[PDB]
Amino acid sequence: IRGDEVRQIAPGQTGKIADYNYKLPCDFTGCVIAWNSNNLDSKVGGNYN
Amino acid sequence: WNRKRISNCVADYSVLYNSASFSTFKCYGVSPTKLNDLCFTNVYADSFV
């Protein structure tokens, strides 16, 4: 996903990602590894994938 | 900081994810998910940079 929306990946969150794309439960046991990949997942002209 | 009174509104959906991508959206006393379901008494918008 983009930058500022990484906060949305957690229980009780809401927004674009946590409402239309990918929702988590409260009774969730597990965890969330998030790390920047601009050097790979971004190219000049912007990735339209 | 500028305080704006808000009244006589159909206050629209939770994050206001129209064009502006909001970095931090952390809510005290109200869960963000329920933010649509309620009717607020005395809303005040405190804006600054």
JSON list of C-alpha atoms in Angstrom, two decimals, chain B residues 6-47:
[
{"chain": "B", "resi": 6, "resn": "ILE", "atom": "CA", "xyz": [-20.01, 23.60, 12.92]},
{"chain": "B", "resi": 7, "resn": "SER", "atom": "CA", "xyz": [-23.78, 23.18, 13.03]},
{"chain": "B", "resi": 8, "resn": "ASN", "atom": "CA", "xyz": [-26.75, 22.06, 10.93]},
{"chain": "B", "resi": 9, "resn": "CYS", "atom": "CA", "xyz": [-24.75, 19.36, 9.15]},
{"chain": "B", "resi": 10, "resn": "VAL", "atom": "CA", "xyz": [-25.16, 15.90, 7.77]},
{"chain": "B", "resi": 11, "resn": "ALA", "atom": "CA", "xyz": [-21.57, 15.21, 8.80]},
{"chain": "B", "resi": 12, "resn": "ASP", "atom": "CA", "xyz": [-20.32, 12.76, 6.22]},
{"chain": "B", "resi": 13, "resn": "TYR", "atom": "CA", "xyz": [-18.41, 9.52, 6.53]},
{"chain": "B", "resi": 14, "resn": "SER", "atom": "CA", "xyz": [-15.67, 8.51, 8.94]},
{"chain": "B", "resi": 15, "resn": "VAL", "atom": "CA", "xyz": [-12.21, 9.53, 7.69]},
{"chain": "B", "resi": 16, "resn": "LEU", "atom": "CA", "xyz": [-13.30, 11.89, 4.88]},
{"chain": "B", "resi": 17, "resn": "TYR", "atom": "CA", "xyz": [-11.15, 9.87, 2.49]},
{"chain": "B", "resi": 18, "resn": "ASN", "atom": "CA", "xyz": [-12.08, 11.89, -0.58]},
{"chain": "B", "resi": 19, "resn": "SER", "atom": "CA", "xyz": [-8.73, 13.15, -1.91]},
{"chain": "B", "resi": 20, "resn": "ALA", "atom": "CA", "xyz": [-6.67, 14.04, 1.17]},
{"chain": "B", "resi": 21, "resn": "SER", "atom": "CA", "xyz": [-4.70, 11.10, 2.57]},
{"chain": "B", "resi": 22, "resn": "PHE", "atom": "CA", "xyz": [-4.52, 11.68, 6.32]},
{"chain": "B", "resi": 23, "resn": "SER", "atom": "CA", "xyz": [-1.40, 10.53, 8.19]},
{"chain": "B", "resi": 24, "resn": "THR", "atom": "CA", "xyz": [-2.62, 10.27, 11.81]},
{"chain": "B", "resi": 25, "resn": "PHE", "atom": "CA", "xyz": [-6.31, 9.65, 12.62]},
{"chain": "B", "resi": 26, "resn": "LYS", "atom": "CA", "xyz": [-6.48, 8.52, 16.27]},
{"chain": "B", "resi": 27, "resn": "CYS", "atom": "CA", "xyz": [-9.75, 9.02, 18.16]},
{"chain": "B", "resi": 28, "resn": "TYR", "atom": "CA", "xyz": [-10.38, 9.36, 21.90]},
{"chain": "B", "resi": 29, "resn": "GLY", "atom": "CA", "xyz": [-13.74, 8.40, 23.39]},
{"chain": "B", "resi": 30, "resn": "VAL", "atom": "CA", "xyz": [-15.12, 7.43, 19.97]},
{"chain": "B", "resi": 31, "resn": "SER", "atom": "CA", "xyz": [-13.96, 4.51, 17.88]},
{"chain": "B", "resi": 32, "resn": "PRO", "atom": "CA", "xyz": [-13.40, 5.63, 14.26]},
{"chain": "B", "resi": 33, "resn": "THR", "atom": "CA", "xyz": [-15.63, 2.86, 12.89]},
{"chain": "B", "resi": 34, "resn": "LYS", "atom": "CA", "xyz": [-18.71, 4.07, 14.79]},
{"chain": "B", "resi": 35, "resn": "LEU", "atom": "CA", "xyz": [-18.01, 7.71, 13.86]},
{"chain": "B", "resi": 36, "resn": "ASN", "atom": "CA", "xyz": [-20.79, 7.70, 11.24]},
{"chain": "B", "resi": 37, "resn": "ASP", "atom": "CA", "xyz": [-23.45, 6.17, 13.50]},
{"chain": "B", "resi": 38, "resn": "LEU", "atom": "CA", "xyz": [-23.63, 9.06, 16.00]},
{"chain": "B", "resi": 39, "resn": "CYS", "atom": "CA", "xyz": [-25.01, 12.58, 16.30]},
{"chain": "B", "resi": 40, "resn": "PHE", "atom": "CA", "xyz": [-22.70, 15.09, 17.98]},
{"chain": "B", "resi": 41, "resn": "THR", "atom": "CA", "xyz": [-23.85, 17.86, 20.30]},
{"chain": "B", "resi": 42, "resn": "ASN", "atom": "CA", "xyz": [-21.24, 20.66, 20.25]},
{"chain": "B", "resi": 43, "resn": "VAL", "atom": "CA", "xyz": [-18.66, 20.14, 17.50]},
{"chain": "B", "resi": 44, "resn": "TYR", "atom": "CA", "xyz": [-15.70, 22.50, 17.21]},
{"chain": "B", "resi": 45, "resn": "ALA", "atom": "CA", "xyz": [-12.96, 22.30, 14.57]},
{"chain": "B", "resi": 46, "resn": "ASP", "atom": "CA", "xyz": [-9.57, 23.49, 15.86]},
{"chain": "B", "resi": 47, "resn": "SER", "atom": "CA", "xyz": [-7.31, 23.97, 12.83]}
]
